[PDB]
Amino acid sequence: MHAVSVGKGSYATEFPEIDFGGINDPGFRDQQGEPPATIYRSDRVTGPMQTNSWWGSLAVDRFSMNQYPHPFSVRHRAEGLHVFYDAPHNMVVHENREAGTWHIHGAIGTDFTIKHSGTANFEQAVVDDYNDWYVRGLLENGAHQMAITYGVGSPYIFVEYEDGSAVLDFDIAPDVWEMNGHVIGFSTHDHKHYAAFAPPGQNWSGIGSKTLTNNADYIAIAKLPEKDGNMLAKFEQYAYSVVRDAVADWTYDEATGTVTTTFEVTTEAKVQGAPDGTIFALYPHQYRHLASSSENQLLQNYQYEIIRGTMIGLEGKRFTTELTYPGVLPSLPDLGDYDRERLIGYLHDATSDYPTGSDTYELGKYIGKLATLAPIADQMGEYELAEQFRGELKDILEDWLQATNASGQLKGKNLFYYNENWGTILGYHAAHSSATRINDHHFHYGYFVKAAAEIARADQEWAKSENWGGMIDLLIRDFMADRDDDLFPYLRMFDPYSGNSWADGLATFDAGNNQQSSSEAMHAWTNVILWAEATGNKALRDRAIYLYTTEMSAINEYFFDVHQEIFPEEYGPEIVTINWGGKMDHATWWNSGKVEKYAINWLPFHGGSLYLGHHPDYVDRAYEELRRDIGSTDWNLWSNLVWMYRAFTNPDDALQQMEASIDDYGLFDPGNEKIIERGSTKAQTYHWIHNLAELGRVDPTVTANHPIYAVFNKNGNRTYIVYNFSDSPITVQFSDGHSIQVEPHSFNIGNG
Numbered sequence: 001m002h003a004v005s006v007g008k009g010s011y012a013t014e015f016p017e018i019d020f021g022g023i024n025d026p027g028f029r030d031q032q033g034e035p036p037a038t039i040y041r042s043d044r045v046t047g048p049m050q051t052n053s054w055w056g057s058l059a060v061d062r063f064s065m066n067q068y069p070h071p072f073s074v075r076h077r078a079e080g081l082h083v084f085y086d087a088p089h090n091m092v093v094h095e096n097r098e099a100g101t102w103h104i105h106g107a108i109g110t111d112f113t114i115k116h117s118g119t120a121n122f123e124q125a126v127v128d129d130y131n132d133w134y135v136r137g138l139l140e141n142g143a144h145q146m147a148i149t150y151g152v153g154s155p156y157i158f159v160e161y162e163d164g165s166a167v168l169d170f171d172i173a174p175d176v177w178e179m180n181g182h183v184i185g186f187s188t189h190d191h192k193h194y195a196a197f198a199p200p201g202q203n204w205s206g207i208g209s210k211t212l213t214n215n216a217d218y219i220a221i222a223k224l225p226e227k228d229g230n231m232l233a234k235f236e237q238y239a240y241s242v243v244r245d246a247v248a249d250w251t252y253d254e255a256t257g258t259v260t261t262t263f264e265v266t267t268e269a270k271v272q273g274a275p276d277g278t279i280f281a282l283y284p285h286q287y288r289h290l291a292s293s294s295e296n297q298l299l300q301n302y303q304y305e306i307i308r309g310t311m312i313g314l315e316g317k318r319f320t321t322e323l324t325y326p327g328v329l330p331s332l333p334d335l336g337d338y339d340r341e342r343l344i345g346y347l348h349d350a351t352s353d354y355p356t357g358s359d360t361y362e363l364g365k366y367i368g369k370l371a372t373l374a375p376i377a378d379q380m381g382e383y384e385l386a387e388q389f390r391g392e393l394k395d396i397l398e399d400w401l402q403a404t405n406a407s408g409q410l411k412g413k414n415l416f417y418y419n420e421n422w423g424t425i426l427g428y429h430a431a432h433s434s435a436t437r438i439n440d441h442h443f444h445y446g447y448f449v450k451a452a453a454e455i456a457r458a459d460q461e462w463a464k465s466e467n468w469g470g471m472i473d474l475l476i477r478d479f480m481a482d483r484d485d486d487l488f489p490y491l492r493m494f495d496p497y498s499g500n501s502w503a504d505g506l507a508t509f510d511a512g513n514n515q516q517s518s519s520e521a522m523h524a525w526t527n528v529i530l531w532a533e534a535t536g537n538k539a540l541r542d543r544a545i546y547l548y549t550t551e552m553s554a555i556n557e558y559f560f561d562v563h564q565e566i567f568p569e570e571y572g573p574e575i576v577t578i579n580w581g582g583k584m585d586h587a588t589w590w591n592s593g594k595v596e597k598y599a600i601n602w603l604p605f606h607g608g609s610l611y612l613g614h615h616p617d618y619v620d621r622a623y624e625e626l627r628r629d630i631g632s633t634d635w636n637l638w639s640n641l642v643w644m645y646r647a648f649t650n651p652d653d654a655l656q657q658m659e660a661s662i663d664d665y666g667l668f669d670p671g672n673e674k675i676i677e678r679g680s681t682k683a684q685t686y687h688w689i690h691n692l693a694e695l696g697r698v699d700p701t702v703t704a705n706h707p708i709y710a711v712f713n714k715n716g717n718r719t720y721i722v723y724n725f726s727d728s729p730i731t732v733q734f735s736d737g738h739s740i741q742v743e744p745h746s747f748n749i750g751n752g
């Protein structure tokens, strides 16, 4: 009646009576709630609702907030759809020295408004359909309707009218520089180039005035790369092919490591003979990895400048990208030159640690910490301590994964609840608007999956579906479901076209959606790979490999700008902390200092963190910039994270800094994260830095034909690491010709 059994656990189906623990703080109490009752979607959109999208404000606001279907920005209003393009004169880079922040952003203006001839008083805008990256927004006023189809990577906006015709309204009269009757090429007063397309015979009127009109029930708008009539002619070819379906289909080739993704649209013809295809605008993370077979479709000189650099290309029905999955590990192995008794001391010191809150995030950080300690305890021969840590993980998870208490009533805290209205699993206690805004389910639940994966590595029985594995699989479905999931939308967190996760469930900001900790996203994907490998779930594993590998490609472009092509030259920092649809910030969601505005995109450190070391020149450049700003190696906070990061390129330096300060303070103290960040430990730090000192640099030039591995290179000497989750021994072949044998449930080397 009020909960559903899943193996030995359960989730609530009615909102629980929350146990506030006597806490009266209104912020805390307000967090223990639900997402909005009203969803602005039509009756054509049923089942679990998509969240965490670039377009989500359309579903949550009566109209919308400002959105970034690059190359455009748009927003829905009662009067119609405002369209804007950030030109170079709209873009700024600002620094607040006192705050230690930087901001790259544009403007919230209007180049023109797409209007309906019958009304400028629409009652609302709803989601009428969506696919993997386009949305169809429907402005409604009784008989009057205007359906707008648009998307990230679409230089078209398609507009379909019921009970009226087209109007384009400008504050200052545009320059119509090409008048083909039914097709016009035009520029705003400030020289931004667009085009509009109607069916043949439906001619544009009002040329030279502030208002352009057309009798058609269909128009398209395009952003033109240049004031160029040859480009206009090309845009005409696909202006009548309205995108209805759009899918990002992927494969993982386990033998080579190649993750192949094909982006395919299906269109509906608005004039006789319109082709089945479109003009895509590709982002850097896409076109830098374009498959050979798609190269012939590139429209070479078709460039658009946006927050994320230069978009380009590309015509037709589909295109394909190719990426390389680099492996992950369950932990670093025992290969460091540490004082083993010193490490054992740190492992025991860690029993003093405790969670600094009762919510899913703080509890998550704590269980992540225990899961990281357990394999290190095993390696040092502290086997009962390792079992103690895994026992504590079991006690915590077996609590959280049951929604009912001993009497069969719903609990008031430490439980999961299925919100049916949206279709999402919410955990209470909640924080960071995980429940009220559907935020951060990857960030939080990734830690629960880490804990489960460490249990499963030692105890396959616990992890069975009929035991505790069903509830873990339910949490994973919430944040990364496959298609046709009866409870959850497809790949909730991930935007397959933008290439990254979006953290905010609702997206009701004028900068679109955002993501701060890309490393906490990569942590979630890693842990699902590990969990799925441990539990024999190939389909789930491969989906997490696709996510890990794609997200990595976006991180290296938009957070790190490893290729030094995207961030403006005048932007001082060597990282963007928070990526939005519409802007980039060197800033945090909480009040922080200098280190945190870098390290929130490094933490936590774990067996999937080696992606951070693929670009040693970047690692050096970012570290040196942070050091310059600090003015020394007296890190303001989270010193251990900076040492661990530094170890990717200079472990001698990291070791020197660590030796100097790691023992400055003693046991766990929540009031002091100067030296050890609260999700980290001395044991983890010491183990990490000494391992990288012995191993050398991450070597992404070598792949393997199994997924759980890493390759390091120290002055030309390679070390090959594999962990085998199987009951049977395996042979792993590496792309440089090397091969190794691995026994069941072990590393090939450094089991300790």
Ligand SMILES: OC[C@H]1O[C@@H](O[C@@H]2[C@@H](O)[C@H](O[C@@H]3[C@@H](O)[C@H](O[C@@H]4[C@@H](O)[C@H](O[C@@H]5[C@@H](O)[C@H](O[C@@H]6[C@@H](O)[C@H](O)O[C@H](CO)[C@H]6O)O[C@H](CO)[C@H]5O)O[C@H](CO)[C@H]4O)O[C@H](CO)[C@H]3O)O[C@H](CO)[C@H]2O)[C@H](O)[C@@H](O)[C@@H]1O
Binding pocket: 361, 365, 431, 432, 433, 437, 439, 440, 443, 444, 503, 504, 514, 516, 517, 520, 589, 590, 673, 679
């Ligand atoms: O060391 C002591 C110090 O530690 C800090 O903990 C760090 C922790 O905060 C950090 O968490 C990451 C987190 O940022 C991220 O979650 C965010 C989520 O926080 C964000 O919420 C925003 C609200 O912040 C915002 O607040 C509004 C406010 O800005 C405005 O001025 O006033 C309004 C008054 O009501 C207020 O509402 O509101 C918007 C909605 O409008 C919310 O969305 O939302 C984003 C998504 O949009 C979400 O991603 O993700 C993770 C947690 O889920 C974390 O990565 O993590 C660090 C490392 O673990 C911690 O060190 C404490 O916060 C400090 O208090 C301590 O002193």
Ligand SMILES: OC[C@H]1O[C@@H](O[C@@H]2[C@@H](O)[C@H](O[C@@H]3[C@@H](O)[C@H](O[C@@H]4[C@@H](O)[C@H](O[C@@H]5[C@@H](O)[C@H](O)O[C@H](CO)[C@H]5O)O[C@H](CO)[C@H]4O)O[C@H](CO)[C@H]3O)O[C@H](CO)[C@H]2O)[C@H](O)[C@@H](O)[C@@H]1O
Binding pocket: 065, 099, 101, 508, 509, 510, 511, 512, 578, 585, 587, 588, 589, 590, 591, 592
């Ligand atoms: O200095 C001591 C105190 O500092 C603290 O932390 C600071 C921290 O709160 C701050 O967070 C930044 C966010 O405020 C910022 O949020 C922006 C939104 O406010 C804005 O909302 C608009 C809304 O105002 C308008 O009415 O409606 C719009 C929709 O129509 C809506 O968009 O949206 C922006 C995006 O569109 C959004 O950016 O977001 C920043 C990241 O981009 C955050 O960094 O950041 C400071 C720097 O890190 C922190 O110092 C503590 O919270 C206090 O307790 C301390 O006392």
